[PDB]
């Protein structure tokens, strides 16, 4: 299709990167078109809006009609309950959490997996971070491939400098560097995984066991992807002594 949502956009983009990596350049013109539509996605690696009270009190006060962007939806007593549940488990904003659940109703994945609607929101949320971060590794990996055309090898290189590292190209040009965002990004994965075991162990001490396992797998994969991206960025001599000292301190504080 052409009007793909965020999830379908990242899943389709991932397939294109694999083609170029597996010596298949049949999607060059289609690849460049995706990086421009997801420019805002590559800028921020992973960032969940903090849970606000304005939407919490407003969502439950008039759970009749919801307006997200240009489209409109109708909320019922059943769907509204899934929004508060998803927002609490992941500590995500009600507006952002609702959009995730709406994407499931449209695509209709509840029947493909046969799971509660509120649980699908957790999987859909983790899938975004997976492809959003995993696709970045392919860009840098292809940009360093020596067994491809020199021209194509340089296209993905300059693109990653601006899309991932937020560094504009040489033909042009308050903002925060990439490393400090990556360090804080990985930090959120650790705090989210730690609070997950504490809460999960409390209730465990069900039909969601496999979902929790898949979420842990996605989290560890995202952490590995972030580590690889950090390594690649450091390989371009884009670090300093402060980051080294911070990493040494984090290692010294390893438990």
């Amino acid at each position: 299709m052409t009007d793909l949502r965020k999830l379908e956009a990242l899943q389709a983009l991932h397939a294109e990167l694999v083609a170029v990596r597996q010596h298949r350049f049949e999607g060059l013109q289609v690849l460049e078109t995706l990086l421009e539509e997801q420019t805002d996605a590559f800028k921020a690696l992973i960032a969940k809006p903090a849970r606000d009270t304005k939407d919490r009190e407003a969502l439950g006060k008039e759970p009749k009609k919801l307006k997200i962007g240009e489209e409109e939806y109708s909320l019922n007593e059943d769907f509204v309950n899934d929004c508060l549940k998803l927002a609490d488990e992941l500590d995500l904003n009600e507006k952002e959490s609702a959009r995730i659940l709406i994407d499931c109703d449209a695509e209709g994945d509840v029947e493909t997996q046969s799971r509660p609607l509120w649980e699908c929101g957790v999987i859909r949320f983790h899938q975004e971070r997976k492809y959003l971060l995993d696709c970045m590794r392919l860009i840098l990996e292809i940009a360093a491939d020596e067994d491809i055309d020199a021209g194509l090898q340089e296209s993905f290189g300059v693109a990653a400098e601006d899309k991932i590292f937020g560094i504009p190209p040489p033909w042009e040009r308050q903002v925060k560097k990439f490393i400090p965002r990556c360090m804080e990004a990985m930090k959120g994965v650790r705090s989210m995984l730690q609070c997950m075991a504490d809460k999960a162990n409390a209730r465990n001490m069900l039909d969601n066991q496999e979902t929790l396992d898949f979420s842990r797998l996605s989290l560890v994969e995202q952490h590995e992807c972030l580590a690889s991206i950090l390594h690649a960025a450091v390989q371009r001599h884009h670090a300093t002594i402060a980051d080294f000292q911070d990493f040494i301190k984090i290692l010294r504080k390893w438990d």
Partner: protein
């Protein structure tokens, strides 16, 4: 929506502050407008704005340069006092919650006098007597403990009362302290200041009473290296301990410049963020007048971006923020021709980052933040606010919302930018200009038409029509969708008496007539279509007009000469049909005329056309 609960509330407050300046009203207190949302969050944020207000609530020189206010020893001195007053009051609240479990609990019973509070504070924090205290006690507590924590809370009077009940024990300290309380700026006279310092240094450099040590060099601003770690164990106790020791114009002396630089240079973020508590470092920088450092620092915490941008705005609407002239610099930097102890914030970049997050699906709020850039330009001269609105429209493609939709009835419902400036002619051309450069003519026309720039509207409308002139106008086709907009532009351009130069304009109304000529020709209304082409006097029908019509073709727009081929054939096929239905001589004569015209005109597909024209004339005979 890309804005979290906290960020959204701030946006609304910034809309008010803009609505006030857009309607010329009183410039309200921005710091108050931001603290209004802070109370909706945990007190971690409220206590920040409390510090922001008290650190910025200094008598300034309105209409004065930013760099000048921040370099003046006059202002630099009041900063230290405003901070000390915050560290003292802040500590006073710590002393309340230490004695009473809740601020509310203390209030219902009544806040006791700073003296009795401190006494009820010593009970807890030292239950048993330390064997190293000196000068006895006062009403059951060591006299020096009372003096210190009273001065720490900022109530010198409460401390002096303690001194009055121990006149015999404290010796000459009474006449010295009574002078400190009297003299302003928390400084003694050089003569008396010398008398006490030498006495302390003489045989009290190492005394077993730490509180005695602390008070003496807080009064004398001595032993700056000794952090009095026995009594000042917290970070705020250190800041407060030093700001009571800074001096102004060589040994055993510390100045704000040294202290402010000494802190972050030697003990940077690393030292103050090991406990993963960000505000601790922010308070260190903000309460030392290093506002740019604290702003950039706090702006990097992805959870506290909102707060750091606004504390920058406050410093910006108070002529206190030191902006970086060059826009190519990093977020934080020290100008080459400035002293090393001050730093500069690239304010333009700061807002540009914050905006990109929610500029995609929340344009209205973005503009409210772009307004603060109204006073700045770039290397090319463009007004930064205007440029930011151009880029935001090119990307978001929100024309009706931001620029005002110009309906096909002649109305211009204003857009969101109309609030900020009434001269919206340039950007509408800027946005129309790029979309024109991207072959988006149908849009560039709507945009140029929104700014009533008929020179460009009709130009582009000429290009979109010429290809479709001979085509078949069918429901929902590209002809109908373009013809119907061209006619909606013909009426609104006649009813309002608007027109471009006659070249662009003549061609535009000429194509509209031709579009009618083929719409009648394709419908079989031969008689009606023949009459139209006759009026236009574009194709000669009597031999006498050939000379003049041929000369006219030379200077007619190529958007017309292009379609000459189809016009001659349709006109011929028109005469051709009417022949099969004196009149015969008249059609025959006109048939000839078209041929000779086409023979003398070099035009598109003259080969196939001139041949077909001749064949159709032969069948007539």
């Amino acid at each position: 929506s890309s804005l979290d609960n906290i960020e959204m509330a701030y946006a609304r407050q910034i809309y008010i502050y803009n609505e006030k300046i857009v309607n010329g009203h009183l410039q309200p207190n921005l710091v108050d407008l931001c603290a209004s949302v802070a109370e909706l969050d945990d007190k971690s944020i409220s206590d920040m704005w409390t510090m922001v207000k008290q650190m910025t609530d200094v008598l300034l020189t309105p209409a004065t340069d930013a760099l000048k206010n921040r370099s003046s020893v006059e202002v630099r001195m009041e900063f230290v006092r405003q901070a000390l007053a915050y560290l003292e009051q802040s500590y006073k609240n710590y002393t309340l919650v230490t004695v009473f479990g809740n601020l509310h609990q203390a209030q219902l019973g009544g806040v006791p006098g700073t003296y009795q509070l401190v006494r009820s504070f010593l009970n807890i924090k030292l239950p048993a007597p330390l064997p190293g205290l000196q000068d006895g006690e006062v009403e059951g507590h060591p006299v020096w403990a009372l003096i210190y924590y009273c001065m720490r809370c900022g109530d010198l009077l409460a401390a002096s009362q303690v001194v009055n009940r121990a006149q015999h024990q404290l010796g000459e300290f009474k006449t010295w302290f009574q002078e400190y309380m009297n003299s302003k700026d928390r400084r003694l006279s050089p003569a008396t200041e010398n008398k006490l310092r030498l006495h302390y240094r003489r045989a009290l450099r190492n005394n077993t009473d730490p509180y005695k040590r602390a008070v003496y060099c807080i009064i004398g601003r001595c032993d700056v290296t000794d952090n009095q770690s026995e009594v000042a164990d917290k970070t705020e106790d250190y800041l407060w301990l030093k700001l009571n020791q800074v001096c102004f114009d060589p040994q055993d002396r510390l100045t704000l410049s040294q202290f402010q630089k000494q802190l972050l240079e030697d003990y940077g973020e690393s030292h103050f963020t090991v406990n993963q508590q960000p505000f601790l470092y922010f308070q260190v920088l903000f309460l030392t007048a290093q506002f740019e450092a604290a702003v950039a620092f706090l702006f990097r915490m992805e959870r506290l971006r909102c707060h750091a941008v606004h504390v920058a705005l406050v410093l910006f609407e108070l002529k206190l923020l030191l902006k970086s002239s060059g826009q190519s610099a990093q977020l934080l930097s020290h100008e080459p021709g400035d002293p090393p102890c001050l730093r500069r914030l690239n304010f333009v970049r700061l807002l540009m980052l914050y905006t990109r997050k929610f500029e995609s699906t929340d344009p209205r709020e973005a503009l409210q933040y772009f307004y603060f850039l109204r006073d700045e330009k770039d290397s090319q001269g463009e007004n930064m606010f205007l440029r930011c609105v151009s880029e935001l429209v090119i990307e978001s493609r929100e024309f009706d919302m931001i620029l005002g939709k110009l309906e096909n009835d002649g109305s211009r419902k204003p857009g969101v930018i109309d609030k900020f400036t009434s001269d919206t002619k340039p950007i509408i051309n800027k946005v129309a200009s790029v979309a024109e450069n991207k072959g988006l003519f149908e849009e560039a026309a709507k945009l140029y038409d929104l700014a009533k720039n008929a020179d460009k509207v009709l130009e582009l409308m000429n290009k979109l029509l010429s290809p479709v002139v001979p085509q078949i106008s069918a429901p929902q086709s590209n002809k109908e969708r373009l013809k119907n907009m061209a006619l909606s532009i013909a009426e609104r351009y006649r009813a309002q008496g608007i027109s471009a130069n006659k070249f662009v304009d003549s061609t535009f109304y000429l194509l509209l007539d031709l579009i009618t000529f083929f719409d009648e020709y394709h419908s079989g209304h031969i008689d009606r279509a023949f009459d139209i082409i006759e009026r236009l006097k574009l194709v000669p029908l009597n031999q006498e007009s050939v000379e003049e019509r041929v000369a006219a073709f030379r200077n007619f727009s190529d958007e017309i000469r292009h379609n000459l081929s189809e016009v001659l054939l349709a006109t011929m096929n028109i005469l051709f049909t009417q022949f099969k239905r004196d009149r015969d001589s008249q059609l025959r004569s006109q048939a000839r005329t078209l041929i000779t015209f086409a023979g003398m005109i070099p035009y598109r597909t003259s080969g196939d056309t001139n041949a077909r024209l001749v064949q159709m004339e032969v069948l007539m005979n």
